[PDB]
Amino acid sequence: MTLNTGPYIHHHAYDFKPGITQPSAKSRDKSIWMSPILKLLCTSYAMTVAGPVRTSIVTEIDGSAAALSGNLRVWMRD
Amino acid sequence: LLATPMINNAIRSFLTAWDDIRILSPDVSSKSLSAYLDSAVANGPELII
């Protein structure tokens, strides 16, 4: 909370860097609400390792991103 | 194999459902094609006595 992680999440920490990432992990139309979740999974891994902070890319999702965006909306009905 | 998963999943339904054409595809009874032919022989009359 005493850190400037504001610009880090929305500049760096990509949810889709179109060359490193896979096209399977492409949150298409649902990216408006999907990207925030994926950007915070990246910066959770980026601050956990004990070096300098680095750009964290979603490489791929096991199962496609629209097969995970539907998986969260099952949980989001509780 | 790049497609929105809902679309990709749809392909599997179509693709496999036509895999049951290949379980009964060209019949392997190419030797027994003659055994299809052999069924008509025994109703031949004896012309030669």
Environment class of residue A60 by beta-carbon count within 10 Å: exposed (0-12), middle (13-18) or buried (19+)? middle
Residues 6+ apart with CB under 8 A from B47: none
**Residue A30, SS3 per DSSP:** coil
Pick the residue of B1, B2, B9, B12 with the most A CBs within 10 A to test the interface with A by mutation: B2
3-state secondary structure of B49: coil
Q: Does A64 touch chain B (CB under 8 A)?
A: yes
Cβ pair A66:B2 closer than 8 A: no
- Among the listed residues A16, A18, A17, A19, the one whose alpha carbon sits nearest the alpha carbon of residue A27: A16
Documented resolution in Å: 3.8
Q: Residue A4 phi/psi, 5° resolution?
A: -90, 65
User: Which of A44, A52, A60, A51 has the alpha carbon at shortest distance from A9?
Assistant: A44
